[PDB]
Design an enzyme around this catalytic site. Structure first.
Site, PDB file in Angstrom:
ATOM      1  CG  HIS A 102      -1.662  -0.615   0.940  1.00 28.20           C
ATOM      2  ND1 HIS A 102      -2.096  -2.247   1.717  1.00 28.20           N
ATOM      3  CD2 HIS A 102      -3.365  -0.961   0.337  1.00 28.20           C
ATOM      4  CE1 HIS A 102      -2.489  -3.136   0.977  1.00 28.20           C
ATOM      5  NE2 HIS A 102      -3.492  -1.893   0.797  1.00 28.20           N
TER       6      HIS A 102
ATOM      7  CG  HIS B 157      -2.094  -1.092  -4.354  1.00 34.24           C
ATOM      8  ND1 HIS B 157      -1.597  -1.810  -5.427  1.00 34.24           N
ATOM      9  CD2 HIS B 157      -3.203  -0.369  -4.112  1.00 34.24           C
ATOM     10  CE1 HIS B 157      -3.420  -2.260  -5.415  1.00 34.24           C
ATOM     11  NE2 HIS B 157      -4.213  -1.471  -4.405  1.00 34.24           N
TER      12      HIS B 157
ATOM     13  CG  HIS C 195      -7.328   2.521  -3.917  1.00 43.08           C
ATOM     14  ND1 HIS C 195      -6.008   3.302  -4.448  1.00 43.08           N
ATOM     15  CD2 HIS C 195      -7.392   1.323  -3.711  1.00 43.08           C
ATOM     16  CE1 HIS C 195      -4.645   2.352  -4.347  1.00 43.08           C
ATOM     17  NE2 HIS C 195      -5.722   0.795  -3.728  1.00 43.08           N
ATOM     18  CG  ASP C 196      -5.539   1.392  -0.387  1.00 36.41           C
ATOM     19  OD1 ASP C 196      -7.007   1.101   0.463  1.00 36.41           O
ATOM     20  OD2 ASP C 196      -5.438   0.768  -1.351  1.00 36.41           O
TER      21      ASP C 196
ATOM     22  CG  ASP D  69      -7.979  -2.003  -4.263  1.00 31.82           C
ATOM     23  OD1 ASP D  69      -7.452  -3.063  -3.528  1.00 31.82           O
ATOM     24  OD2 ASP D  69      -8.077  -0.764  -3.605  1.00 31.82           O
TER      25      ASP D  69
ATOM     26  CD  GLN E 235      -1.441 -14.387  -3.601  1.00 32.96           C
ATOM     27  OE1 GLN E 235      -2.449 -14.357  -3.745  1.00 32.96           O
ATOM     28  NE2 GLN E 235       0.030 -14.327  -3.189  1.00 32.96           N
TER      29      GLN E 235
HETATM   30  C1  LIG Z   1      -7.987  -9.370   2.563  1.00 30.70           C
HETATM   31  N1  LIG Z   1      -7.365  -9.643   1.109  1.00 30.70           N
HETATM   32  C2  LIG Z   1      -7.609 -11.453   1.089  1.00 30.70           C
HETATM   33  C3  LIG Z   1      -6.361 -12.303   0.706  1.00 30.70           C
HETATM   34  O1  LIG Z   1      -6.381 -14.037   0.647  1.00 30.70           O
HETATM   35  N2  LIG Z   1      -5.317 -11.739  -0.693  1.00 30.70           N
HETATM   36  C4  LIG Z   1      -4.634 -12.116  -1.069  1.00 30.70           C
HETATM   37  C5  LIG Z   1      -3.676 -12.818  -0.808  1.00 30.70           C
HETATM   38  C6  LIG Z   1      -3.319 -14.289  -0.475  1.00 30.70           C
HETATM   39  C7  LIG Z   1      -2.394 -14.629   0.288  1.00 30.70           C
HETATM   40  C8  LIG Z   1      -1.166 -13.753   1.691  1.00 30.70           C
HETATM   41  C9  LIG Z   1      -1.153 -12.713   1.121  1.00 30.70           C
HETATM   42  C10 LIG Z   1      -2.250 -12.341   0.421  1.00 30.70           C
HETATM   43  O2  LIG Z   1      -0.307 -11.957   1.521  1.00 30.70           O
HETATM   44  C11 LIG Z   1       0.509 -13.233   2.410  1.00 30.70           C
HETATM   45  O3  LIG Z   1      -0.898 -14.748   2.102  1.00 30.70           O
HETATM   46  C12 LIG Z   1      -3.731 -11.429  -2.299  1.00 30.70           C
HETATM   47  N3  LIG Z   1      -3.282 -11.808  -3.603  1.00 30.70           N
HETATM   48  C13 LIG Z   1      -2.165 -10.625  -4.378  1.00 30.70           C
HETATM   49  C14 LIG Z   1      -1.159 -10.239  -5.463  1.00 30.70           C
HETATM   50  C15 LIG Z   1      -1.572  -9.579  -6.449  1.00 30.70           C
HETATM   51  C16 LIG Z   1      -1.814  -8.064  -5.270  1.00 30.70           C
HETATM   52  C17 LIG Z   1      -2.272  -7.657  -4.039  1.00 30.70           C
HETATM   53  C18 LIG Z   1      -2.846  -8.807  -2.947  1.00 30.70           C
HETATM   54  C19 LIG Z   1      -3.471  -9.790  -2.299  1.00 30.70           C
HETATM   55  C20 LIG Z   1      -4.861  -9.159  -1.335  1.00 30.70           C
HETATM   56  C21 LIG Z   1      -5.587  -9.831  -1.010  1.00 30.70           C
HETATM   57  C22 LIG Z   1      -6.327  -9.047   0.013  1.00 30.70           C
HETATM   58  O4  LIG Z   1      -6.187  -8.109   0.738  1.00 30.70           O
HETATM   59 MG   LIG Z   2      -8.078  -1.436   0.088  1.00 28.58          MG
HETATM   60 ZN   LIG Z   3      -6.082  -1.706  -3.072  1.00 29.51          ZN
END
Ligand SMILES: CN1CC(=O)N2[C@H](c3ccc4c(c3)OCO4)c3[nH]c4ccccc4c3C[C@@H]2C1=O
Ligand SMILES: [Mg+2]
Ligand SMILES: [Zn+2]
Ligand SMILES: CN1CC(=O)N2[C@H](c3ccc4c(c3)OCO4)c3[nH]c4ccccc4c3C[C@@H]2C1=O
Ligand SMILES: [Mg+2]
Ligand SMILES: [Zn+2]
Lengths: 313, 313
Positions: free
Chosen positions: A77, A81, A117-118, A217, A270
């Site tokens: 963030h 981003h 947005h953030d 986002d 993920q």
């Molecule tokens: C609330 N929330 C739930 C969530 O589970 N995620 C994913 C994610 C999954 C597993 C992770 C993770 C993020 O960081 C460490 O282990 C995830 N994968 C990305 C690839 C690129 C940019 C942002 C994300 C996010 C962000 C997104 C989020 O904001």
């Molecule tokens: Mg947000």
């Molecule tokens: Zn965002």
């Protein structure tokens, strides 16, 4: 400022020299200064400076402000981003044949908005309702700027212009709160499955534009394995550092997603994400403007690299 | 500043000339300037300036900052709420024989903290979990100050001093989030019903100190019908104006507690509160130090005026 003067008296390349028109585009290579020229371009090849006759020197005094008012301390963030979300905004707009569905207002909102947005994130996120507080601190910060002197890019609109846009910007930012986007989408996900869709209808202009804001986002989730993974290791860095903090002052344990361990199960986390949020938000989108597939696809191309990595746990 | 200079070379009355030592005390009569002399006294008759040899001129440069850094636009969460929560903190401490139960550290935290539990409120509240966001914006603002130059009232402590206190201050402010205080209290409400109480145990020093912080937050709910009602019409003002706003930008209806109407059912909303939160939080406290009855009572004295007003709906 030896900063504004510079970005001021430079040369904003082009949507092509800068390749800011592709879902595969990344911030990674170019320096901040440049992520300024691009953005400036963004407004430009978007007709924002010309219609709303934005003062050159202020679009730049704004942006720079907008930027410096970001922390390179957080590991996702960060300014990079917002830029990457304005970009993915600026592309699903053009190369997505989406622009042709919005007004010139809703387009200024989404650029101005999306680059905020953030706005003042600190590294305090979730995983599952808070009524969008973090989001009003962003808008309140958004607005804090737009009003700021010498950075007033809307000081060219009219009362009902500045209003109609603050109503989009705000409602817009506040839509990055997946919570709302989940306590909503479920419906905007039938105007499709029943095709009864329609953007002329205000409310739907809301649900759309929102589902669109989050779509961007999560922009980096449908990015080339390189560009994408290079980022998840950043969001990871943050999600883990948030657990570390909340196990020092407070004495709670981590919610997996945020514990420095479980790094081995990061894939299925993920993966789960995509299936729980990403996939349908992008496919469904596609149907609106088929010129968006590049996203829904890059996604499926990534939710098969995770399913791979994960099939080894 | 013709302000600081002033409050600097003036005269901080006394705990008695100022009557800052009674649960029945109110801000109402005295001007801000004075709400500073008091507060200044508060530190003073609390041993904060002498132990931590706080620079006279800085406690005041601090305070003024802390103050000016508040909005007289909100109709409750204004400087006069912090003052009235530092007060109610300063009296349950003395006249409540509670002070004899805390270190000199946890007492600076609580004063410093308490005059910042809601540092940059804008009028965005709740009615029922957000993980304490608004609270970190407060702490982050709390800290923003303490660090500020010329307003550093802790620049006299040691590394492990300034730490131990920020751990309290922070954990403290962040405890004004009734959510947490409700996702906790339930237990700290058995160390009593099981008397297994004990403040020597750290964790319990937490739960205590917290339950105590909110105790002072709601400070005005146990104030003499005059002082109390005079305030609920303020908190009301805010709760309603937040509804009007969120029926303008957004198009939602109001949660009763926040609609400009339903003003007739304000009693039973004032009543249910006390029974859902106030009552127990104050009676139970008392047991810790019986010298706090003045609150649990004033409350009961108020939860019988609402039961009257309400018995007419
Ligand atoms: C609330 N929330 C739930 C969530 O589970 N995620 C994913 C994610 C999954 C597993 C992770 C993770 C993020 O960081 C460490 O282990 C995830 N994968 C990305 C690839 C690129 C940019 C942002 C994300 C996010 C962000 C997104 C989020 O904001
Ligand atoms: Mg947000
Ligand atoms: Zn965002
Ligand atoms: C979630 N929640 C429930 C609730 O019902 N209330 C009360 C209340 C009752 C009726 C009202 C009201 C507040 O404002 C307008 O009409 C109430 N009465 C006060 C007096 C002084 C300071 C704060 C409050 C609150 C705040 C407190 C709260 O935060
Ligand atoms: Mg509060
Ligand atoms: Zn408060």
């Amino acid at each position: 400022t030896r900063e504004l003067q510079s970005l001021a008296a430079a040369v904003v390349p082009s949507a092509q020299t800068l390749k800011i028109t592709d879902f595969s585009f990344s911030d990674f290579e170019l320096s901040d200064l440049e992520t300024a020229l691009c953005t400036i371009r963004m407004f430009t090849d978007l007709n924002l400076v010309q219609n709303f006759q934005m003062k050159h020197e202020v679009l730049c005094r704004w942006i720079l402000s907008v930027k410096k008012n970001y922390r390179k301390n957080v590991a996702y963030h960060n300014w990079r981003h917002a830029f990457n979300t304005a970009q993915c905004m600026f592309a699903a707009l053009k190369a997505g044949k989406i622009q042709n569905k919005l007004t010139d207002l809703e387009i200024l909102a989404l650029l101005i908005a999306a680059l905020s947005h953030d706005l003042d994130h600190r590294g305090v996120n979730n995983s599952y309702y808070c009524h969008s507080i973090m989001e009003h601190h962003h808008f309140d910060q958004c607005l804090m700027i737009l009003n700021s002197p010498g950075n007033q890019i809307l000081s060219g609109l009219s009362i009902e212009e500045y209003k109609t846009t603050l109503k989009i910007i705000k409602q817009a930012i506040l839509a990055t709160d997946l919570a709302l986007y989940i306590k909503r989408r479920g419906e905007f996900f039938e105007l499709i499955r029943k095709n009864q869709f329609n953007l002329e209808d205000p409310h739907q202009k809301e649900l759309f534009l929102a589902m669109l804001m989050t779509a961007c986002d999560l922009s980096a989730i449908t990015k080339p394995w390189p560009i994408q993974q290079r980022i998840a290791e950043l969001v990871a860095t943050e999600f883990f550092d948030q657990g570390d903090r909340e196990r020092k002052e407070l004495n709670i344990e981590p919610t997996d997603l945020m514990n420095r361990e479980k790094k081995n199960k990061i894939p299925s986390m993920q993966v789960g994400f995509i299936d729980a949020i990403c996939l349908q938000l992008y496919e469904a989108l596609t149907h609106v403007s088929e010129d968006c597939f590049p996203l829904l696809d890059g996604c499926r191309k990534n939710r098969q690299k995770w399913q791979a990595l994960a099939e080894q746990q």
